[PDB]
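Note on ligand handling. Small-molecule inputs were canonicalized before submission; formal charges were left as drawn, and no protonation-state enumeration was performed. Where a ligand contained multiple stereocentres, the stereochemistry in the source SMILES was retained. For adenosine-5'-triphosphate, this procedure yielded the string shown in the input block below.
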Amino acid sequence: LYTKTGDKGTTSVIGGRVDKDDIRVEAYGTIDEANSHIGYAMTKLQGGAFIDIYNELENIQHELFDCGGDLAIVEQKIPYKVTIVMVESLERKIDLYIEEAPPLERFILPGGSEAAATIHIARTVVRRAERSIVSLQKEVKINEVVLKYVNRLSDYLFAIARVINARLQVKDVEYNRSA
Amino acid sequence: MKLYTKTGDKGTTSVIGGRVDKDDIRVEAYGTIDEANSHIGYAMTKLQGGAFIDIYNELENIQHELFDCGGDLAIVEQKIPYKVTIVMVESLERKIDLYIEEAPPLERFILPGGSEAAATIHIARTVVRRAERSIVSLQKEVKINEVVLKYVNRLSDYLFAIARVINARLQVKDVEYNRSAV
Amino acid sequence: MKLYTKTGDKGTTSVIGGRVDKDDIRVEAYGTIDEANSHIGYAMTKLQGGAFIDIYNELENIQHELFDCGGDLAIVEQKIPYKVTIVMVESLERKIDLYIEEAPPLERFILPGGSEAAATIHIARTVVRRAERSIVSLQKEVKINEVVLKYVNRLSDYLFAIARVINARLQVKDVEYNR
Ligand SMILES: Nc1ncnc2c1ncn2[C@@H]1O[C@H](COP(=O)(O)OP(=O)(O)OP(=O)(O)O)[C@@H](O)[C@H]1O
Ligand SMILES: Nc1ncnc2c1ncn2[C@@H]1O[C@H](COP(=O)(O)OP(=O)(O)OP(=O)(O)O)[C@@H](O)[C@H]1O
Ligand SMILES: Nc1ncnc2c1ncn2[C@@H]1O[C@H](COP(=O)(O)OP(=O)(O)OP(=O)(O)O)[C@@H](O)[C@H]1O
Ligand SMILES: [Mg+2]
Ligand SMILES: [Mg+2]
Ligand SMILES: [Mg+2]
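Structure output:
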């Protein structure tokens, strides 16, 4: 598993090698970090009551993995994998879950059920990856669809976090000092 | 009620009093505060027992103060009064002395972990400190509510303190760094 | 006592051999090692089974070694002796060889997830790799104990290897990229 070729700080990317602190590798790594959190959250959504959300998450892990591949491409040796079609799929689901969840009355704070809490954490990591992608874009040309996808994904995560709390008979945690 | 507007699909976003790139140090500080807040929210799910009523309510309040920190940090040129005050920082200090007093004597570095609850608080602790580094960067570019830096600095001590109390109440002994002379 | 001294309220803090701003790359590397160590601490709570005493015990040791990594990185101009040596890196290598042998043959690309224990280890893996990127950035500004870079590099491989062994022992298949 270990080749030791990266022991000095450089690593391999599609079409070349770069320093491990290259913004391209930071973006790629944070996408991986975000994908890991979704993997954890998924171990809490295996029940029948969450088949819909769980299957979508499995697919999202593949798409997130594809985002990584699209970003770690110094020399375009292959077309991009992430397409606008995948963003629209996220959009259709977000509309469905916003309809399912109760009306949003107050500002939401991350937390509630264990499952929703983990999804809330994954959401913040996805947002941190988005900032890295924005930085990357400032230096090199990127698959702009990846930025739209990661941007839309945190909204999807926000949507299901609320649906998850609702299904589990737990109210969302709200910003409310009158409570 | 439609979450996505797509206005941020190109990398820019809104802040209080203007628009900036999503990788602006300001948005990063704000985002990391949110990240820290999410870890505290997860940790809380493990602290609803009757043995942690005091800590749970404090974390509940802290989620609000942390959210307020993000609001103060996302304010450009200050169109509204800041929300984070020294009073909230002092409240943190009084609790820390209380928890240090409750926990067994601390004489050396300890491994972060133990109980599931304390482990999560320890992670939240590191994310808060990460947020602190971003706030420090922010302050070098623009004027901020300096109280927010004090609060974030002090909050990680609070988290360190309750993590040890949680393990203690759960009878999980701290593991001291094996470099015994440190 | 007073855990807080308030000397850091203005944005500066001390390292071994001086004081610097908290956003200095040295403090960031140090901080991210602490973050990675904390994630390992959480993962360990999921590996308390009698079937995981070996992995748990090795992770506990790694936590001490991560503290050594932290200390080494905080040393300004070799104010004091470095503690992380090549011996610890090779120790990781031997365990990796053993775990690759234990786990089933790796055929497809793995996505982070599976058993909750493995899922949490995968997350810790990404944080370790994030810590590595900061160390690489630090090394570009100052001379560091190069062995810490090798250790942190090899560490993520160790974590990846035990994640798979953990799923295997729990009789859970690894989540693989497959659509
Ligand atoms: N610290 C890191 N953060 C994010 N991505 C990384 C990091 N290190 C490597 N990668 C990416 O992940 C892939 C595989 O990782 P791996 O650790 O095998 O690379 P390496 O460190 O260069 O090799 P080695 O582990 O043998 O030293 C590489 O193609 C590289 O682009
Ligand atoms: N990636 C990010 N990290 C941290 N904070 C963000 C990020 N994106 C947006 N924000 C902040 O959070 C708030 C709401 O997030 P939201 O995602 O709705 O913004 P946006 O991305 O600009 O809009 P849209 O999602 O419709 O494209 C904004 O006011 C913005 O300042
Ligand atoms: N935000 C941070 N991220 C990473 N490492 C830090 C951070 N703040 C401090 N450190 C490091 O950890 C050590 C102890 O942390 P501590 O918070 O006690 O320092 P401080 O903030 O300077 O002091 P005080 O908390 O009394 O203001 C210091 O030696 C410092 O190098
Ligand atoms: Mg957005
Ligand atoms: Mg401090
Ligand atoms: Mg490596």
